[PDB]
Amino acid sequence: QQAALRNQQAMAANLQARQIVLQQSYPVIQQVETQTFDPANRSVFDVTPANVGIVKGFLVKVTAAITNNHATEAVALTDFGPANLVQRVIYYDPDNQRHTETSGWHLHFVNTAKQGAPFLSSMVTDSPIKYGDVMNVIDAPATIAAGATGELTMYYWVPLAYSETDLTGAVLANVPQSKQRLKLEFANNNTAFAAVGANPLEAIYQGAGAADCEFEEISYTVYQSYLDQLPVGQNGYILPLIDLSTLYNLENSAQAGLTPNVDFVVQYANLYRYLSTIAVFDNGGSFNAGTDINYLSQRTANFSDTRKLDPKTWAAQTRRRIATDFPKGVYYCDNRDKPIYTLQYGNVGFVVNPKTVNQNARLLMGYEYFTSRT
Amino acid sequence: LRNQQAMAANLQARQIVLQQSYPVIQQVETQTFDPANRSVFDVTPANVGIVKGFLVKVTAAITNNHATEAVALTDFGPANLVQRVIYYDPDNQRHTETSGWHLHFVNTAKQGAPFLSSMVTDSPIKYGDVMNVIDAPATIAAGATGELTMYYWVPLAYSETDLTGAVLANVPQSKQRLKLEFANNNTAFAAVGANPLEAIYQGAGAADCEFEEISYTVYQSYLDQLPVGQNGYILPLIDLSTLYNLENSAQAGLTPNVDFVVQYANLYRYLSTIAVFDNGGSFNAGTDINYLSQRTANFSDTRKLDPKTWAAQTRRRIATDFPKGVYYCDNRDKPIYTLQYGNVGFVVNPKTVNQNARLLMGYEYFTSRT
Amino acid sequence: QQAALRNQQAMAANLQARQIVLQQSYPVIQQVETQTFDPANRSVFDVTPANVGIVKGFLVKVTAAITNNHATEAVALTDFGPANLVQRVIYYDPDNQRHTETSGWHLHFVNTAKQGAPFLSSMVTDSPIKYGDVMNVIDAPATIAAGATGELTMYYWVPLAYSETDLTGAVLANVPQSKQRLKLEFANNNTAFAAVGANPLEAIYQGAGAADCEFEEISYTVYQSYLDQLPVGQNGYILPLIDLSTLYNLENSAQAGLTPNVDFVVQYANLYRYLSTIAVFDNGGSFNAGTDINYLSQRTANFSDTRKLDPKTWAAQTRRRIATDFPKGVYYCDNRDKPIYTLQYGNVGFVVNPKTVNQNARLLMGYEYFTSRT
Amino acid sequence: APATIAAGATGELTMYYWVPLAYSETDLTGAVLANVPQSKQRLKLEFAN
Amino acid sequence: NAGTDINYLSQRTANFSDTRKLDPKTWAAQTRRRIATDFPKGVYYCDNR
């Protein structure tokens, strides 16, 4: 019957231990690996991080030099640009369980959503003191002319723990036996450059000189963030067992079958607690600023929409979250305080009712969620 | 507790039945007809002993009446001589309900090689395709008549030694129903450019092809002289109270580079899965797929593989590849089984998606009658 | 004295735990790494697999594009062909202990022996239904003409566990500290192409156009097969300790000193339990279909041959095992049910009594064996 | 290393470096215990060009 | 369209059995018994009252 007291007590014990760990341990961010390579030779890498304490996440620095060898035509950044330097990232913990498995662009948009502004960007102000884009932390030339070489830098934070204060999703890596694995599939000369008229979704640059663009090199450095000198007690190490037994993951998917003026519904799976949802309307390679959509919504089994909104009003809600708009055709939904959980109510779905549908149209979905390891 | 003993008893009873009864394969019905008149038949098997399955022999003569154009076998060919099969037991409970091609592919998966095929070897002794057990001419030229032979095994029992799914009909009284829908002049021939999925021949002369006639003979396989003990007949109650069925379904909504997930239902113990990528009438050898997988919600992929590596696993099971666009997955040792609907899904992430694309699914599973 | 009861009990406990692990865990096959490279730049790679649960083995997919740039002459596949895409494979477990260390051709012949037919081949039948070589799982053009480019695909299974049901040789990889290592030494432009008259043993193609053949690229993908969600008990994880403390390895060697009509004997070492033996008679670069051999045998210290047979009768025994013959000059011996163990009887040797011996003749031996980790 | 390389000639060089962790073969001061599968050691070499 | 683009319509239970798998005209016949005429082209009705 009742006995649910266990949960209540478990939550309290988990929160208490989390606090003790945060108070007693010390945060460390350490380089684990750096490599420079030619994408023509290789683009997929498997990084083996260190097994020390509780791992919170990885900061991945990526730099690249791209030369546009075309005789006459230039190329220009796509909407995602340097966020496409990493095509896909997948993490496995010591028990070989998969956590995040998503695209670089999705990971980057979530980094932005969680910062509350374009990730690691430099705001512009009227200050006479010379603050500004001094260090080019995330940077890429808007265009690369025929014969020119452009230099790019972009960063991604691959999260395990939900935040610096909420260790839900963190990973205990102390078993010398099995290693963690951070797999990075980088852009290469076949994904980074889109010809005029081709789909720019996964590309960095697009334009009439694309066929002659090539990477001179790509370099990456993985920094691992963790907590060391974990606190001990009578029963050994004090550890938030729920935090460490919960997966905090980002995943993406693709769905097709849209038709003008008809509700296109993407169901949320059960068991997962969805914190945020991103929907990219790849309208056959065209990315529009809401003009190809009637409305978007989140709906429960009951025909009840909780936020059926026209595109600009939907965008207004997002401006309250990241202080600007996501790129054309990218829509965001924050459900952090009340995660979508199909057990709480009936099934739930994310809805897009398109106004215009080009051939090969599809919705690319990105999700942020918590789920029990077991 | 219990069960340990229920299963132990079931297995003991199965063994006694196999040891004491005697297997019989008997013709129950034969018929010749012209599909222009009829193509659906309801065969009434005999209610005797424990029924294990039915071997269905189908022969047909196809005439290409075109003036100058020929037709050639589709990838499924004679496997499409039977379009669908449905079996109802004496208690009005359905077991298998699937297509002829899916049934045939499962027959192959269970044999471990193309069903009833003749393997080619260097033997100087004249073994070989002597009897043309499953046979069909590669092409039928304009004005020619081709002769075809096809066999299907409709299973009730899982195998010759595992009676799970078998049917007790020595008593039931009420009749069994083996429903067969055969190919006809509208399904057997595909014009150039048309979808060849359900057809036997395709080509420029298709519009003028027709069946001269089709014949079928159903053989029933059962166990007779059932063993009797104290309480009466010794029977494996679990085996006889479990359904072993094959079923098919169709799913659409595929989009390039996006995971297309087909959820497995709960309650069923899925032994195998077949997925056919009918890419708008085009059937490709993996080139239109990024990867296939089986996935558990919140536990990721247990076998996310590129098409060739997926095909490699299948080569270990049937010693060759299934036809273009046909993908197989063996889960016999550890059946897909979720207590919650869709806690597991079959995944196909397509590279190329043509108009009218869809996945035709085929399942082999066990489930309780109750 | 007795007390050997311990062994008997240990075996029972090992078998019981193996069964529980097989029944309770779930099998997973997951990609760990993929790379495309130019053999002119590099051909040796060290792959770091994931440390998750009990590792059973690795399925390695290798593809390549080879162009014959010769102006006029073609090249043809050698007897081993694509099986020589990988020259050598070596595996080290987390404790840095070496398991398999052998040639790609030997590993492939053992894959065939254990399947009971040419590994991952497509048999030919009279079926009218279009089964067949649809997916080209293991494939290579028989010849590559002057100016043409051929595409190849081959697969190797690198075993740790003996089989899917016998976990002897499997590896427990849970220590985050030390990584496993799978080293692959691939073919390159110096090993893959043999000139007319040169030794074809390690080459893929041989012919008058060989000097102008080159790889355009080689690509590999390593898939790791393992058991996850291992069963736990009162004493923690239930594990077959003998299985996990036994090495199941493949190794190869070379011996010379053959003389016509004289028994050439290769001794089996002590301690190892030899499951199979492969002997390749590289008769100075010539590979013959038994015609250069009087007989082969396995012999114990006692002049007692257990199977002294003429080449065709030896080949007949092999046809019962793999349903066909191994390539010219390749001889196989199955000792799986009663492994050669020099403790069981005196020393034992594999014998070849050659009829003809060319200059630079040698026997290349391949062994499959079990041995105690300690 | 050849003392000189004439116009048009190619010279071949060989050199060795011992990068010490331990002070000597008998004094292990400075040696490194490398048994944690997690984190790797790293030896960076910046060559002449 | 007036049924010409449909093979059949039905109501089916998980048991995979159909309680009324009918060709379009026969499906329409059942509706004619309910409303004394046919619904407009492409509109199909099913009474489960």
Short mmCIF file of C-alpha atoms in Angstrom, two decimals, chain A residues 97-98 101 247 253-256 270-272 359-364 371-372, chain B residues 253-259 295-301 304 340 343 353 355:
data_model
loop_
_atom_site.label_atom_id
_atom_site.label_comp_id
_atom_site.label_asym_id
_atom_site.label_seq_id
_atom_site.Cartn_x
_atom_site.Cartn_y
_atom_site.Cartn_z
CA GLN A 97 25.49 2.55 -20.80
CA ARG A 98 24.85 5.26 -23.40
CA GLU A 101 23.88 10.54 -28.39
CA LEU A 247 20.74 9.38 -16.93
CA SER A 253 15.59 11.98 -34.25
CA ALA A 254 13.99 12.65 -37.61
CA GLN A 255 10.36 12.30 -38.75
CA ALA A 256 8.66 12.88 -42.09
CA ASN A 270 6.97 7.05 -21.87
CA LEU A 271 9.33 6.78 -18.88
CA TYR A 272 11.51 9.70 -20.03
CA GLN A 359 9.51 17.83 -51.14
CA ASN A 360 11.67 15.90 -48.67
CA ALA A 361 10.36 17.95 -45.75
CA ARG A 362 11.04 16.63 -42.28
CA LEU A 363 11.14 17.62 -38.63
CA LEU A 364 14.41 17.04 -36.82
CA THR A 371 15.53 8.62 -17.16
CA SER A 372 16.28 5.87 -14.65
CA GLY B 253 6.26 7.87 -42.42
CA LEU B 254 9.96 7.51 -43.21
CA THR B 255 12.18 10.55 -43.75
CA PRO B 256 15.86 10.74 -44.75
CA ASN B 257 18.35 10.46 -41.90
CA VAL B 258 15.71 10.20 -39.19
CA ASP B 259 15.16 7.13 -37.01
CA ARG B 295 16.33 -0.25 -29.25
CA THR B 296 15.04 -0.10 -25.68
CA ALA B 297 13.65 3.20 -24.39
CA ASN B 298 16.27 4.53 -21.94
CA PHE B 299 18.79 1.73 -22.61
CA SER B 300 19.78 2.63 -26.18
CA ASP B 301 20.63 0.29 -29.08
CA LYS B 304 22.83 -0.63 -34.23
CA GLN B 340 4.97 -2.14 -21.38
CA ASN B 343 9.46 -0.60 -24.37
CA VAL B 353 13.23 7.81 -49.13
CA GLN B 355 7.47 8.47 -52.63
#
